[PDB]
Design a protein around this ligand. Structure first.
Ligand SMILES: [Mg+2]
Ligand SMILES: [Mg+2]
Ligand SMILES: [Mg+2]
Ligand SMILES: [Mg+2]
Ligand SMILES: [Mg+2]
Ligand SMILES: [Mg+2]
Ligand SMILES: [Mg+2]
Ligand SMILES: [Mg+2]
Ligand SMILES: [Mg+2]
Ligand SMILES: [Mg+2]
Ligand SMILES: [Mg+2]
Ligand SMILES: [Mg+2]
Ligand SMILES: [Mg+2]
Ligand SMILES: [Mg+2]
Ligand SMILES: [Mg+2]
Ligand SMILES: [Mg+2]
Ligand SMILES: [Mg+2]
Ligand SMILES: [Mg+2]
Ligand SMILES: [Mg+2]
Ligand SMILES: [Mg+2]
Lengths: 399, 62, 59, 95
RNA sequence: GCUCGCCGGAAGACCAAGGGUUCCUGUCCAACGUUAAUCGGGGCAGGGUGAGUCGACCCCUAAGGCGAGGCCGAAAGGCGUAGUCGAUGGGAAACAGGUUAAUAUUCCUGUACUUGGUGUUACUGCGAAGGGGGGACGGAGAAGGCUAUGUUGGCCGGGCG
């Protein structure tokens, strides 16, 4: 960070999420400001506070991106389905640079029209055609600005752009709720025993996540090399350090977009009793929701991690460099081995993740205390810390 | 050690020997699986055992 | 189909345990390392958000 | 058999493709055990320490290869590999 | 990969022996290979040999060896009794199918068998280093009954070029 190279990337990201938080306050019609500021006090539907985390306080206060970049991810999965079932997209996806980036531009162009459609869904069902029109216009202007803004953070900014968009979007929604808690902390209105029990549980859960990350699962690999220069004499044991979750950053945001999609389509109408059947089903006070949610998390984590690594490329690499897993045949069998093993790991990873998601709600149902601490946002925050500290160390090895 | 062990009775010493042997087994078991980062422990236990035995003998020898 | 899904999940649970045996047991030193590292990073992000939004909400 | 002797009998769990295949297909573990250990002693040790019920024990003795470290010719040590078959209900612990 | 040619009572499949990792996979090409080598029975690294029924061990002896005492001999030693060793011989029991890059009558699937130990139940005179039977034995010849096996026909799949 003391190097201007990464420092300007970070001061690009900071500014990007600062105009994210500038666009987060801009009213949907021309000036509805006070009217909306009344409607965002939730005369109905408290859980909409979750919808204000990913949008940077859009459903909290009056913005141009209402769901934020959540439409994009809802497209990012859709095309990713269409790439699988439809062969014609499966050919363009394997096509290298322009072929993969044309699919990403079709994901961007499906995204913007999905923001049009969801602005149609809101401004038809929930709020009310002049208001409807100003709604659709401000919402597509915001989703477009933010989509550009998050493809700029991937390039001239730090790390992955969309990741940091959502991560800092939820990170920047916290301070008022805790400001009120620490103002009531010099009084004692809400007892300090429950709040310090949750204060120690956030910290010990994050600690357990990062302790399960501390001790790894390492596959011992061996190198036998003596260089022909008669100098280097080498028998080397190198661990391949498998982590319980492989970049658990993105499938978290993905799974969250797939939670909030039926909550957008079903709950904005309410005149549909089936839609409200499933959006009440999908309210996270119920075991049914957590079942559908579990299947979602495991499917998206398995699919995404299976996407990331190519165990045949990794094994062939290991073979090229003159490395072997002792006792296992180089080539295909190393592939099958590391793949089966990585599967057996990542499944456990997505499992303990679905548990960090589910448990806080049963804890809040049993206990008197009733969104940031509900298990989704706790996890995404643990992942902001993990992501930033892994990306800092990767370039601290460089610097 | 070895002063501390001389202050123990014979029964206690046998129990001690069993404990040491169990630690030895577990240790080389972890070492074979490549799960043992600290190798030095082996030499520590293996030697401690000897100590115990040398005591047992000397107590049954006098 | 459901009994084969059952036996499959039982096999995947055997795999689970197999990967639990390679899981490292409690250590208090790495506990304090993790603890203080994450406490520090969280304190940094919190001081950023507070230094900004405290003076922003105040105005 | 005395528990002192048992503890010195099992050297190490063996890894390989064939070991893997064995463990998955036949519910069988493969151990590297003492040169002088017997099918009896091995059965006893695995039933004692890993708290599992054993069906049957097969054994073989691998002869050592002949290797050269910096032109010096050594001859590696023979060792006894034991295939151990657990009862089908038994589950596999690694400790 | 497609043609062509050779062996086929062997230039084929499998054992004992003698060797001892040459077996299998990866990788390497200096040396080794009567040439080249990207290949190897070469270098380097990792694997691989699973038995109550196969063999050895074991019980029993042949030739022959050793041999308590013993006889004989300058000394060393030589011979030999009781004994005890010695297979190339006698002595209990497993087959078909599946499977590995590499083992399988050894693993697995199925269906068996043997000899001991212990327990129940019924019946009952048991007991050796001794006694008797058996084990237990040549050459040639013949032809009667068979199977291994093969050919035709029937059947079944496929083919009308
Ligand atoms: Mg068997
Ligand atoms: Mg054997
Ligand atoms: Mg040696
Ligand atoms: Mg001829
Ligand atoms: Mg060689
Ligand atoms: Mg070969
Ligand atoms: Mg050349
Ligand atoms: Mg040459
Ligand atoms: Mg070779
Ligand atoms: Mg036999
Ligand atoms: Mg004789
Ligand atoms: Mg004499
Ligand atoms: Mg004589
Ligand atoms: Mg004899
Ligand atoms: Mg013979
Ligand atoms: Mg015989
Ligand atoms: Mg073969
Ligand atoms: Mg007789
Ligand atoms: Mg005759
Ligand atoms: Mg016939």
């Amino acid at each position: 960070g003391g190097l201007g190279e990464l420092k300007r990337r970070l001061l690009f990201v900071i500014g990007a999420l600062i105009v994210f938080r500038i666009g987060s306050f801009i009213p949907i019609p021309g000036i509805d400001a006070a009217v909306l500021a009344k409607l965002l006090e939730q005369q109905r539907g408290t859980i909409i506070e979750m919808f204000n985390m990913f949008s940077g306080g859009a459903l909290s206060r009056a913005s141009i991106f209402a769901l934020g970049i959540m439409p994009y991810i809802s497209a990012s999965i859709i095309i990713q389905l269409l790439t699988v079932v439809h062969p014609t997209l499966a050919e363009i996806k394997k096509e290298g640079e322009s072929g993969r980036r044309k699919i990403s531009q079709y994901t961007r162009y499906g995204t913007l029209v999905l923001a049009i459609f969801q602005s149609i869904g809101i401004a038809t069902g929930l709020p009310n055609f002049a208001f409807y029109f100003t709604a659709v216009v401000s919402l597509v202007t915001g989703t477009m600005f933010l989509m550009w803004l998050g493809e700029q953070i991937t390039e001239r900014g730090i790390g992955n752009g969309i990741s940091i968009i959502i991560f800092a979007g939820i990170v920047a929604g916290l301070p008022p709720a805790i400001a009120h808690t620490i103002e009531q902390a010099r009084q004692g209105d809400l007892h300090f025993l429950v709040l310090l029990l949750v204060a120690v549980l956030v910290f010990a859960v994050t600690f357990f996540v990062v302790f399960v990350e501390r001790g790894q699962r390492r596959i011992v690999v061996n190198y036998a090399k003596r260089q022909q220069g008669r100098r280097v004499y080498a028998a080397q044991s190198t661990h391949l350090p498998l982590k319980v979750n492989m970049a658990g950053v993105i499938p978290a945001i993905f799974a969250s977009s797939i939670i909030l999609f039926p909550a957008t389509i079903a709950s904005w109408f309410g005149g549909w009793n089936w839609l409200t059947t499933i959006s009440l089903y999908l309210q996270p006070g119920q075991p049914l929701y957590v079942l559908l949610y579990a299947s979602a998390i495991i499917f998206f984590c398995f699919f995404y991690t299976a996407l990331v690594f190519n165990p045949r490329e990794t094994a062939d690499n290991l073979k090229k460099s003159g490395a072997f897993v002792p006792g296992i045949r180089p080539g295909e069998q190393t592939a099958k081995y590391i793949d089966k093993v990585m599967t057996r790991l990542t499944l456990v990873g997505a499992l303990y993740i679905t548990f960090i998601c589910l448990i806080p709600e049963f804890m809040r149902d049993a206990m008197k205390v009733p969104f940031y601490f509900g298990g989704t946002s706790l996890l995404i925050v643990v992942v902001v810390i993990m992501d930033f500290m892994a990306q800092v160390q990767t370039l601290m090895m460089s610097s | 050690k070895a002063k501390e062990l001389r202050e123990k009775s014979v029964e206690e010493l046998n129990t001690e020997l069993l404990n040491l042997l169990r630690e030895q087994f577990n240790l080389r078991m972890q070492a074979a699986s490549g799960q043992l980062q600290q190798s030095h422990l082996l030499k520590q236990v293996r030697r401690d055992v000897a100590r115990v035995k040398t005591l047992l003998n000397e107590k049954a020898g006098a | 189909l459901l009994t084969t899904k059952g036996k499959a999940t039982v096999a995947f649970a055997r795999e689970a345990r197999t990967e639990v045996r390679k899981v490292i047991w409690p250590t208090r030193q790495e506990t304090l390392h993790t603890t203080l590292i994450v406490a520090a990073v969280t304190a940094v992000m919190s001081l950023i958000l507070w230094g900004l939004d405290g003076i922003l909400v105040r105005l | 058999i005395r528990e002192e002797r048992l503890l010195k009998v099992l050297r190490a769990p063996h890894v390989s493709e064939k070991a893997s295949t064995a463990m998955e297909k036949s519910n069988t573990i493969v151990l590297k055990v003492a040169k002088d250990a017997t099918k009896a002693e091995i059965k006893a040790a695995v039933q004692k320490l890993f708290e599992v019920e054993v069906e049957v024990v097969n054994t073989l003795v691998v002869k050592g290869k002949v290797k050269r470290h910096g032109q010096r010719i050594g001859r590696r040590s023979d060792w006894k590999k034991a295939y151990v078959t657990l009862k089908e209900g038994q589950n596999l612990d690694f400790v």
